[PDB]
Symmetry: C5
Subunit: 310 residues, 5 copies
């Protein structure tokens, strides 16, 4: 039973994040629990303060006409309990729910361990005969308690794009708003647990430049290449199948090379020292002791710069 | 209370995918959230535009008779909230829900990392006294926003088989429609993380052709064979028990061989170099240095062609 | 308000499997989605075809008395939506639901990779004053679409035991029916991924019979014994704690032996070749080269025969 | 509307287990599906057999006053459908439901692989003005069909503590009953899959007593110590964090020692055979060949006795 | 229909934990099942004891006005069944539910294996025209049965902050209470299964100080470094991505070093014993045999003190 207007009735929205949690890098989703604040003029139930009752009159959902405000990017129907409805005398309605749905926003894993994000929440509203434009009321949008969690992410800002986007969707215009949650990752536990350990094995790898034994040079360069897979696999696991290249997927894959040429050297420093020409052997071996850490440190500056500095 | 017809009443369907996500290769399911658009002539509630009210009249579900449109391949009862019902004067009803159910469509892992798919959504409708044929209205089927996700899959097209399939199921004909979601995989992260690393270990494996030590040739060929299982197992895990053979299950199993004969060689290059006949040893060893990468590259062309080129 | 009979009222049942999925070997359960067809004479609402209305009269569940048909082996209350109720003039009722519950049927893992199964679904019905016998109507039991899935299982037949079992359960007889789903496993992906790889490691294990080095004979027989645990563990995982012995649990455990005596040999071929008696060493080592694959192939024929051939 | 009594009204209870399953050693819970049989004198609806109707009168739940019988140790609200209600003439009510809730009973993992258990189900009932004592009717308690499952557990007995425990809980006495499900584990699959394999690796470990090579003695004792972790980890996983010590956690940890002193020996039989004193070496090595299996078999009798024999 | 007051109506709260379980260190949540005790003066339904009925009058929820008491940190809408409502004559209401929701409280993993915690449960209550202050009634707060579980945690105390926190949230003050569950971990199973085994491997690592062979010194220090990752990975898994440093993440990462310089030494004791200067070699090697365990034991006292002693 919608409110007879003279023009496109505006519905005023707001979101107060109460809880944030379980951001799931694999599925690219996150769970939010927040307030939903709606409001509109329904002159139809304006009501004579003096003449009866009091300042503001409390209704149940069934009485009033209420606008269907559906979330756009969501696994299932949102999950709200209603908190209070209060009609002002000028026929102005004040709605407040407290929903909790899991939200499907995509992430950009281009800088993986060192990445910043921009989560989205949507809310469309389809029209009937009287058009619906949604818009934001920025006093009920200051939504994000000084308690918002989000394990392993620093929360930067919850803002929103004032100007809605009015679509034409199946012979009925809808109106869609963009609520933005800006977060940066807590890269760090990525160092003691991935980055450093991954590097340490890589150095030990090429300790076999100061060695002459093949037996202990493969028991060396090879035994470390395995450990790398343990890390490649550990990392490849808490991360989705990007159609593009990650930063750690880069330096994790650049690494695979410095083991391949590493093994090449030890190998050559053999069909080169069984061909009685150790003239060359401990000449090559002597060089790798520099070429490597330098090509590396060079390629990491090349690689690093390639991703962040551009 | 169904609409007295003169012949099989047609119900006109449509689906606008709002969200796609969590395609689960193991369980062979995916979750979809979309619009469901139904419509039919129920002359029974035609209504004199001029004589009363307005252009179109809004009903609640309970009032009108509405057709039971059940999804065929679905874990549980679909999960829909109703969005609007609008009856035209000629007794024409306009229905719109916004459901979200998880869908059971099978996948063909024959080309695993490099595979394309054809997801299905069904919709039957069982009859009573007046028959039900369903059919598609292609203005409400253009369903798939320029935002449809599906992590790690490129979406190609959402179309549908106009001609329904009318069954006879337990003394009552049902009518089933075929909605098709065509997707190709984002093979790629499959390279830096599986294909390449898997290959690198295989090469190092057979570095033991340029070596004479048994101690360092098993510490060699064997230490890599393990790494392979770490990959076989990693891969075998994010994949169901196909009764047929995968492509990577092929080349992952073709590989097991090139380690077995690899180990055979190093082994023979021993009970052949302890039998003072290194005449033969560094003759065989010398050969393997070619036989292998060639039998391989040959067998991969043989293998690859076998799967895609046919 | 139950139908005044003159004797034990018969209720006629049937099930049309629409979907089968997620058979869970660990929990010994499976999920089914099907039609449930019930029917009985309730002379009490017979109704004069000519005198009023039409051929058959449609009721809601609340109107008619309907028999509580509870599933016996089920995690939770079954999960049904009602599809149609149609009363015939002779007072004969036609019921049809479309439930989906997860079913607790046990499995016999005696032949694990090569095992066939017999799933059960139950349906009791407790009496009040007029007794209830259930029984099957085999036109609504032909239930299993040419689409029934069940990943990694070949479905053989869905039949049912016509004669119910009438219990006395707490001073009220119930009537229970036995619906049988017969399935065989898709053993196969068990070969390229378990059986073969498991065998290959076992062979390499005992390549150390054609070797003299202890260093490379333990680096040998031992490095494979580990791989076996990787498989024992992989297999032990997708299988419950049987109080009996599996077939692959057998040959997986028979295997552990052929590594133990394998290691015994290499060990003895040492405190026997450091005791300057290589007379004996390369005599024993020479023999194992046959004793083993033969005791094995013999014991697998002994073992295999023991399970299937009896 | 509770039944005006002259003293504490007794409610008579009973449970017929229909299904048992998914006993979860980690969470310490199990799922049960059973009958719940209640009964009490509500003289208030006694009813003149001859004067009207019949022998017993069938009511719906809403009519009669029924006692709130809540389960004490349960994840969520129990999950019951009602099966039948029958009031006797003397005002005696006969209730019967068929619930299925998951039950939180603790387990004693002190003897882990060889442990017996005592599951609990509770049922309180809070009073109003007339007190409620619950008590058991042992004809509706013979609950446990000759079909009760419980994968990997032998079921011994379902009995119950006739005498309830009347609490005072928040100015209202409740009455709690103790239903006991006694089960022993099916230890066995624990042998071919854990116990034996775990032992075999331990023996091979100390084959390095009949060896002189350090290279092959570490490639020996060490390569097995890993295998052990694979088992320690496999076992530690299907088991909760006991604040006490398991039996297999014991013998799994006693084992870690026999690898440590095992490695100590091989190590010493080296900075003792490079100090040209093989006088001592193959004297110590010679001894370990006994000290070990004996200290072990001794410590296992010491250990085993310590747990079961006391 | 809220109770006309003369000032901010106080609502008196309380919680009786019946069950605690599944504390999930990764997600930082826990599941609780407890009583919720509310109470307030609604003079509006005071009721003449003598004049009619009895001492206290039982209502259903729909009759009385009841305050919306929403939990603040919760995944979804809490999950409560109502247990009893009793209105006193002075218009005083007595409410009792029995909810079960999963609770989002954060944890401080700074001392991981040896950490104590402080779980929170919240309860706000938004106002309308008459303000709501909540407050605690400490006879219905003694909530935590002598049965409260919480696997692998010792429960210390369930108390609550008497003084609520009255917010202004969107032009309506809410009133929030703090219920505290204080728990310490059952560190222990962390020793036989993580701490000790992790240490053992570390010692064996540096047995290669009493050795001269490079071949068996890398087959040594390296083979253990892998085992460490198996533990680093095992531990890193049952723990979230802290933006700070764990204690075991410390000593697990301090360890990585003592393997790196460990490998450095064995490596140097080679390009130093192939340079015919074993003067120095078995001088350095001789020293490491002390420097290491001491730098360690020193650094663990340095490390340990750094975390707990401050
Ligand atoms: Br491993």
């Amino acid at each position: 039973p919608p409110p007879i207007a003279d023009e496109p009735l505006t519905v005023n929205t707001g979101i107060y994040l109460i809880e944030c949690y379980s951001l799931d890098d694999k599925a690219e989703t996150f769970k939010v629990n927040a307030f939903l604040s709606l409001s509109w003029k329904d002159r139809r139930l304006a009501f004579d303060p003096v003449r009866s009752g009091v300042r503001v009159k409390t209704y149940e959902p069934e009485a009033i006409w209420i606008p269907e405000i559906r979330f756009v990017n969501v696994e299932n129907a949102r999950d709200a309990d209603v908190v209070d409805i209060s009609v002002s005398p000028d026929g102005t309605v004040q709605y407040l729910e407290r929903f909790s749905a899991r939200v499907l926003s995509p992430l950009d894993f281009r800088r993986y361990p060192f990445d910043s994000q921009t989560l989205h929440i949507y809310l469309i509203v389809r029209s009937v005969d009287t058009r619906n434009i949604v818009l934001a009321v920025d006093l009920e949008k200051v939504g994000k308690n000084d308690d918002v969690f989000l394990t392993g992410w620093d929360i930067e800002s919850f803002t929103a794009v004032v100007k809605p986007a009015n679509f034409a969707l199946e012979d009925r215009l809808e109106s869609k708003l963009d609520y933005q949650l800006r977060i940066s990752r807590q890269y760090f536990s990525y160092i003691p647990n991935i980055i450093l350990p991954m590097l340490f094995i890589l150095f030990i790898s090429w300790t076999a430049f100061w060695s002459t034994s093949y037996e202990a040079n493969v028991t060396l360069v090879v035994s470390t290449l395995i450990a790398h897979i343990a890390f490649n696999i550990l990392v490849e696991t808490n991360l989705p199948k990007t159609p593009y290249m990650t930063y750690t997927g880069a330096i994790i894959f650049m690494i695979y090379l410095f083991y391949f040429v590493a093994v090449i050297e030890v190998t050559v420093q053999h069909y080169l020292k069984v061909e009685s020409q150790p003239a060359r052997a401990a000449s090559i071996t002597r060089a790798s002791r520099i070429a490597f850490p330098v090509v590396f440190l060079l390629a990491n500056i090349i690689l690093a710069f390639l991703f962040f500095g551009f």
